[PDB]
Design a protein around this ligand. Structure first.
Ligand SMILES: *Cc1cc2c(cc1C)Nc1c([nH]c(=O)[nH]c1=O)N2C[C@H](O)[C@H](O)[C@H](O)COP(=O)(O)OP(=O)(O)OC[C@H]1O[C@@H](n2cnc3c(N)ncnc32)[C@H](O)[C@@H]1O
Ligand SMILES: *Cc1cc2c(cc1C)Nc1c([nH]c(=O)[nH]c1=O)N2C[C@H](O)[C@H](O)[C@H](O)COP(=O)(O)OP(=O)(O)OC[C@H]1O[C@@H](n2cnc3c(N)ncnc32)[C@H](O)[C@@H]1O
Ligand SMILES: *Cc1cc2c(cc1C)Nc1c([nH]c(=O)[nH]c1=O)N2C[C@H](O)[C@H](O)[C@H](O)COP(=O)(O)OP(=O)(O)OC[C@H]1O[C@@H](n2cnc3c(N)ncnc32)[C@H](O)[C@@H]1O
Ligand SMILES: OC[C@H]1O[C@H](O)[C@H](F)[C@@H](O)[C@@H]1O
Ligand SMILES: OC[C@H]1O[C@H](O)[C@H](F)[C@@H](O)[C@@H]1O
Lengths: 576, 576, 90, 90
C-alpha cells in the first residue's frame, strides 16, 4: 500500500463509486477504503440478487438483506422473562447487555435504521428505484434562477441515470404489471399519472434482470489494468477509516487514519483530496470522531467549534405498507378477449382469441401468453402465466399527493412469507412520506459507549414532526387504503401499517448541504465541500437538506457528480 | 469451454472438490460444473462466515443460511384463509400453488430437507463438524477383517482431516467452552467422555476462526496458473447438468448434457470419466432423469431396469434441540479464584488472583481473562469476557448413548434470537439420532411435476422406522433433558423439541454403497463406481448405507478419496 | 351486570368466548411433523375432536357459533338495537 | 368482545373500536343443511354451511365498507398496531 494518493475515498458504495468513476477517469491517483469485504462474486460490489438461483426463488432474498442490515442503535432491553428455572443465573436489573445502547431513548429512536458493511455498500441489496426529485423535494443548486437550477438538475440527473443504467421499460411485457398499471391509469384518469418505477437495471431475458449496483457505476478493479492502462485506482477492503486529521487553522485535512482489520495495523494515509462517502450515519460518526460537531449528548451551553449543524435536521421518511389479493374482476379481465369452450383437462377444451381485433382489451402478445398458459396448464385456475414478472408501478410525488409510491413485488418482505394465497395474485403497496427537517431531530454519538468497531456509538433523538409531516403521513395511509382497494382487498397478515421508523433506510440531512453555513444551518456547500476546508468533501444522502419522499440515491449521486466538477477545477492530478 | 475433458465433475461442494484435488493434482484435464454461482468473496467457494462483519455479528449469519436453503418438497398448502375481502379472487380448491408438490404426502415428508445452489455448495455455510464414525455407524470397506477394515478407514479419515484442516483445539482457551466441558466431564466421570467437537477450522486470532469449506479442499481457480502451471482445471458456474447419456448396452456414459443458464444454450460435454457430486438429492435426480432407477410414483409391478435400489433405504437423522441459561452455580464458579477488593466502579476496586496457586480451580489463562474483564468493565454483572468464544463440546456416539451431540452455540438458530437474556449465558444442545435404512423409505421423482430448473420434482416417502430408531429418538430426548439440566434450566422459547424431519441435512443412502448390487441392495461399489458402468462415479453422503448419528461429510469425503484411487489406476490423463 | 365485570371490562371477552360453541368445524389438516417418533401418529387427517366431515372449509361460516344457557345469547350481547329502515326491512 | 390479545402498552383511554357491518343479498345457493349421518354433541343432525358472500352488490359494498372504515377512522386517529383494518371470520 502507498503512502500518498491524489484522492482518497472512504466507502465503496454507489456514491463513493461516483467519485471513483469521475476522478479515476479524469486521471487522478485514487485510493478507496471500505470497512467491509468483497462478497458479491467476481464482479466486485455487484448486486447480490443477480444470481439465477435468487431470481428463481425470489422469496429467499429477504434473508440476504437481513443478513447485512446491522441495527444502528438498539435500546436496552426490558422484556420480562419470569419463567426461567430457579437454578439459572439472572440479574436483578435490565443491565447493558447484548450490544444495546444505554444512551438510547427507545421512544425517540429510528429502531429500523441499520447499516451495511460490505464492498458496494447497500447497493449490493437495494431495490434499484431511481426517480428524480421534482422541485418541491429538491435542494437548490442555483438561487433566483429557477431555469438555470432546472437545467443544472436535468444535466446531473441524466448523467446519474447513465451511470446507474436507469430505465422505465424493463417490465413492459409483464401481464401483472400492465394489469395493475392500466387499471390505476383508468381509475385516476386525469387526476394522477402512473408509469413504471424508474429502475437501475437492464433485463437480460424474460426470466432475469441484471440489477444495477456500485459495480455498474465503477467496476472496482485495481488500475492500471489491460482495459484501463493509464488509470490509477486501488481498493482496500477490510479497512476501518477512523478520523480525518485537521490542521490547526481548521482549513485543511492533513491525513486520514485508518485501521487494517486483517493485520491490525494503524496508518495515516495522505492525499490532496479527502472524500467521505461512508453512509449517512457513518460519515457523521467519522467527522464527530475527528472533532467536527460535538461528541456526546447534545449540550447547547457548549456550542461546537466546527459545524454546529452536523447531526441536526435529520430526516427519515414515514413508510406505510400493505399487500393485496387481486380482485376477481381484474383476474377475469386478464382473459376478457378469450373464447373458452369445453371443460379444462378434457380433449374438447379450447381457448382462442381473435388476433388484432380492435374490440380486444389486450394486445396480441398478452392474449398469446394467456392462451398458452391456459392450454398447456389446464389444471391451473388462473390465467396469469407462472413466470410472469411482477408489477413495478408508481405514481410519483406531486403536491396533491405528496408521497412516493411503489406498487408491485419487493424482495424486502417484512413478515413470514405467506403460502396459502397464490403469489400471482399478490401486489405490494409502499408509500413513502417526506419529513420536515427540524433542528431537534438528531443523530449524535456517545462519548462513552462504542460500537463493534470501537468507534463512538450512534444514538438518535427523533420524532416525526407535528404539523405537515404528521398530517401528510396519515393522509398517505388513507390514500394507500383508498388506492389499493381499486386492485383488491388486503392480504391477511399484511394489513395496512406504518413501518418501524428508519426501516426506510432513506435517512438524509445528517451533514446537510446549503449555500451558507449559518443562514442555511448546514455543513457542506453546493460543491459538497465542508465549510472552511479546502480539501474535504462529503457524499451521500446525508447531504440532502430537504423533505423528500422519493428514493434519494439518484439525487445523492447527482450531487456527487457536481462535487467532482469542483474537484476537477481545483486540484491537478499527479503525473503518472 | 472445451468439448472434451478427461474428467467432468458435477457440483463444486466439498465432495466434488475432493475429486478435483485428487485428479487435478494427478495431471487429469478436469472440468467442474455447478448449477450455482460464485457469490462468496475472492476465495472461490469459501465459507461465508469468514468475514470480520459476521464474526463481529454472529447472530446475523442464520440469515445467510436461510437465504440458501431451498426446500426440497413442499406439499400442497391447506391453510384456510377465510378473511379475504369478498372482492378478492378466492380459491375453490387447495390447488397447486407457489411451487408446491402435489405428489407429496405431507405426513410422510422430510419437510426440513433443503438444497443449496452456490459455488462450494453447503460448505459455504456449514457448521464444520467433522467427526469420524466408529465401527457401529460405518459401512465396511474390507469384509471379514475388522482390523484391516479399521486400518483402511484410519488411512482415509486421516487424509480427509488433512484436506478439511480438522482439529480439536481451536476453542481450547474459551472460558465457556471449558466451563461446560469440565462440568460434563465431572458429572459423567467414568461413564462418558467429552471433548471438543472435531471442527474443520483454523484459528487466526483470539476473535477470528477461519472456517473450512470446499475452498479449503480445492481453491477452485482455473488451471494452469502461476502456482500450478502444469495442471488443468476449469470451473463453469451457472450450468445446470441434466443427464448422463447411457450407451444402449448400459456399460458406459457417452456424454453429459448441460444447460448454460446465462446464455440459455444446451451442449453435450464428452469426458473419459464422469463424477456426480451434486448432493444426496440432486445426484439421485440427475440419475433418474438419465434412465437409472424408476421415474414416477414407485410401482413394483414394473421394476426398473437399472439400479433398482436407487432412491430407496434413505436415512435422515432425528434431531432434538434446546437452549439453556447457565446455572448461578457455574457462573459464580467462573470467578472462584479472584480476590475482589472494594466495590465495583471507583478508582479503588481491585480484582486480582495468584498465578499458579494450588488452591486455584482454573488455569492462569482463565483467571487472567476473567480478572481483566472484571477490571475493564466493572459495571458488568458477569465474569465472562465479552469476546470469549462459544463452547464446542461433544460426547461422541457410543453403544450406551447412540446419538451424536453438539453443545455450545450454533449459528443456525431455529427461532427469533432472544435479546432479553445475556448471550454469554446461553448454551445450545443438539442431539442427533441414527436411522435404520428401510426399503420403504424413499426419495423419488415425479413423472409430471417439475422443479425450478425444469427437472423431475423430488418427493419423499419417509417415516422414522418403528423399533430401535424410534425408541432411540425418544431416549435421546430424555438424555438431552437430563444432561442439559447439569448446566442450567431451559431458555423459554427454546424448550426441548424434535426438529422438522430433514432439518439436519444429513440425508444418506439415496444412492447407497455396498459390495454386491443385489445382496447389499446398493447402487455403487466400494470404488464409488455405479454397477455395470465403467466410467461413472457418485460422491457424497448419498453413498453412506448405514444408520449414522454423527455428521456425515467427513465419511463421504473418505469414500471419495478411495474412489479417486480407483480412477487413477484405471484411466490415463491426456497429454498436456 | 356485575360490579366486578364493569370494574374489569377487559375480562368479559372470556365469558363470551366460554359460551360460543362453534356451529360447524371442518376437519383439521394442520401438519404437526415434530412429534416424538414414539408417539401415536395419524396416517390421515381423520375425523377428530368434534369436527364435521361434511363441511367444506372454504364455503363455511367458521365464526358461526351458538350459546346454550338460559337467556341464550342475550346473556352476553352488546345490546345494540337499531331499527331497520325500509331498505333493509321486510 | 375483543378479537385479539388485549394490548397493554397503549392507554385504554386513547382506544376506539370500529365495526362496520355489511348487508348480504339472500341467495338460494347459500345454505344451512344438516347431515343424515353426522350428529352434534346432543345427538341431533350436525349442521353444515354452504356459504359464500354473493358476487355483485354484496361484494362491492363489502370492499367499499372496508374503504369507508379506513377513511372514517383516520379522522379520529391512526390504527392501533395489532388491530389493523381487517375482515372478520364469516
Ligand atoms: C438495504 C436497502 C437500501 C435501499 C433499498 C432497499 C434496501 C433493502 N432500496 C433503494 C434504496 N435507495 C434508492 O434510492 N432506491 C432504492 O430502491 N436503498 C438505499 C440505498 O442503498 C442507499 O441510499 C445507498 O446505497 C447509499 O450509498 P452510499 O452513500 O455510497 O452509502 P452505502 O451505505 O451504500 O455505502 C457506504 C459504505 O461505506 C462503508 N463504511 C462505513 N463506515 C466506514 C468506515 N468508517 N471506514 C471505511 N468504510 C466505511 C461501508 O462498509 C459501505 O460499503
Ligand atoms: C446447510 C448446512 C449443512 C451442514 C451443516 C449446517 C448447515 C446449516 N453442518 C454440517 C454439515 N455436515 C457436516 O458433516 N458437518 C456439519 O457441521 N452440513 C452438511 C454439509 O454441508 C454437506 O454434507 C456437504 O456440503 C455435502 O457435500 P457435497 O456432497 O459436495 O454436496 P453439496 O450440497 O455441498 O454440493 C453440491 C453442489 O452441486 C450443485 N448441483 C446440484 N445440482 C446440480 C446440477 N444438476 N448440475 C450442476 N450442479 C448441481 C450445487 O449447486 C452444489 O454447490
Ligand atoms: C354472542 C353475541 C350476540 C349478539 C351480540 C354480541 C355477541 C358477542 N350483540 C348484539 C346482538 N344482536 C343485536 O341485535 N345487537 C347486538 O348488540 N347479538 C345477537 C343476539 O344475541 C341474538 O340475535 C339473539 O339472542 C337471538 O335471540 P333468540 O332468537 O331468542 O336466540 P338465542 O340464541 O338468544 O336463544 C335461543 C335459545 O334456545 C336454546 N336452544 C337451542 N336449541 C335448543 C333445543 N333443541 N331445545 C331447547 N332449547 C334450545 C338455547 O339454549 C337458547 O338459550
Ligand atoms: O423497506 C423500504 C424500502 O422499500 C422499497 O424497497 C424501496 F425501493 C426502498 O428505497 C426502501 O428502502
Ligand atoms: O440444524 C442442523 C445442523 O446442526 C448442527 O449445526 C450440525 F453441525 C449440523 O451438522 C446440522 O446440519
Amino acid at each position: 500500500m502507498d503512502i500518498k494518493y491524489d484522492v482518497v475515498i472512504v466507502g465503496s458504495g454507489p456514491i463513493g463509486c461516483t467519485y471513483a468513476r469521475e476522478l479515476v477517469g479524469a486521471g487522478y491517483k485514487v485510493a478507496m477504503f471500505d470497512i467491509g469485504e468483497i462478497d458479491s462474486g467476481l464482479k466486485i460490489g455487484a448486486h447480490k440478487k443477480n444470481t439465477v438461483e435468487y431470481q428463481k426463488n425470489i422469496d429467499k432474498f429477504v434473508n440476504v438483506i437481513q443478513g447485512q442490515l446491522m441495527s444502528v442503535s438498539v435500546p436496552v432491553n426490558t422484556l420480562v422473562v419470569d419463567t426461567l428455572s430457579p437454578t439459572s443465573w439472572q440479574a436483578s436489573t435490565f443491565f447493558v447487555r447484548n450490544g444495546s445502547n444505554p444512551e438510547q431513548d427507545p421512544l425517540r429512536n429510528l429502531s429500523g435504521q441499520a447499516v451495511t458493511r460490505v464492498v458496494g455498500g447497500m447497493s449490493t441489496h437495494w431495490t434499484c428505484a431511481t426517480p428524480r426529485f421534482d422541485r418541491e423535494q429538491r435542494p437548490l443548486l442555483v438561487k433566483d434562477d429557477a431555469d438555470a437550477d432546472d437545467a443544472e438538475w436535468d444535466r446531473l440527473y441524466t448523467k446519474a441515470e447513465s451511470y446507474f443504467q436507469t430505465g422505465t421499460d424493463q417490465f413492459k411485457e409483464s401481464i401483472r404489471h400492465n394489469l395493475v398499471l392500466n387499471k390505476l391509469t383508468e381509475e385516476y384518469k386525469g387526476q394522477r399519472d402512473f408509469q413504471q418505477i424508474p429502475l437501475a437495471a437492464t433485463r437480460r431475458s424474460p426470466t432475469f434482470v441484471e440489477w444495477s449496483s456500485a459495480n455498474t457505476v465503477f467496476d472496482l478493479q485495481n488500475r492500471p489494468n489491460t482495459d484501463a492502462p493509464e488509470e490509477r485506482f486501488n481498493l482496500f477492503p477490510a479497512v476501518a477509516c477512523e478520523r480525518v486529521v485537521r490542521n490547526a487553522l481548521n482549513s485543511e485535512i492533513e491525513s486520514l487514519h485508518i485501521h487494517d482489520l486483517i493485520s491490525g495495523d494503524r496508518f495515516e494515509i495522505k492525499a490532496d483530496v479527502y472524500v467521505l462517502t461512508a453512509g449517512a450515519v457513518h460519515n457523521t460518526q467519522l467527522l464527530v470522531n475527528s472533532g467536527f460537531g460535538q461528541l456526546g449528548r447534545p449540550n447547547p451551553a457548549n456550542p461546537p467549534e466546527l459545524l454546529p449543524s452536523l447531526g441536526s435536521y435529520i430526516t427519515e421518511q414515514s413508510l406505510v405498507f400493505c399487500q393485496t389479493v387481486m380482485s376477481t374482476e381484474l383476474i377475469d379481465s386478464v382473459k376478457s378477449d378469450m373464447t373458452i369452450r369445453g371443460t379444462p383437462g378434457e380433449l374438447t377444451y379450447s381457448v382462442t382469441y381473435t388476433p388484432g381485433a380492435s374490440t380486444n382489451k389486450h394486445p396480441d402478445w398478452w392474449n398469446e401468453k394467456v392462451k398458452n398458459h391456459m392450454m398447456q396448464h389446464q389444471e391451473d385456475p388462473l390465467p396469469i402465466p407462472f413466470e410472469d414478472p411482477e408489477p413495478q408501478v408508481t405514481t410519483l410525488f406531486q403536491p396533491s399527493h405528496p408521497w412516493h409510491t411503489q406498487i408491485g413485488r419487493d424482495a424486502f418482505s417484512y413478515g413470514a412469507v405467506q403460502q396459502s394465497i397464490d403469489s400471482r395474485l399478490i401486489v405490494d403497496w409502499r408509500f413513502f412520506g417526506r419529513t420536515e427537517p427540524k433542528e431537534e431531530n438528531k443523530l449524535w454519538f456517545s462519548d462513552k459507549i462504542t460500537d463493534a468497531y470501537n468507534m463512538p456509538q450512534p444514538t438518535f433523538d427523533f420524532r416525526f414532526p407535528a404539523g405537515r409531516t404528521s398530517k401528510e403521513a396519515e393522509d398517505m395511509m388513507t390514500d394507500m387504503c383508498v388506492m389499493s382497494a381499486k386492485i383488491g382487498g388486503f392480504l391477511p397478515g399484511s394489513l395496512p401499517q406504518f413501518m418501524e421508523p428508519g426501516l426506510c433506510l432513506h435517512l438524509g440531512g445528517t451533514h446537510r448541504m446549503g449555500f451558507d453555513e449559518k443562514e442555511d444551518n448546514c455543513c457542506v456547500n453546493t460543491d459538497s465541500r465542508v465549510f472552511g476546508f479546502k480539501n474535504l468533501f462529503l457524499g451521500g444522502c446525508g447531504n440532502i437538506p430537504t423533505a423528500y419522499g422519493a428514493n434519494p440515491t439518484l439525487t445523492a449521486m447527482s450531487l456527487a457528480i457536481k462535487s467532482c466538477e469542483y474537484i476537477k477545477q481545483n486540484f491537478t492530478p499527479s503525473p503518472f
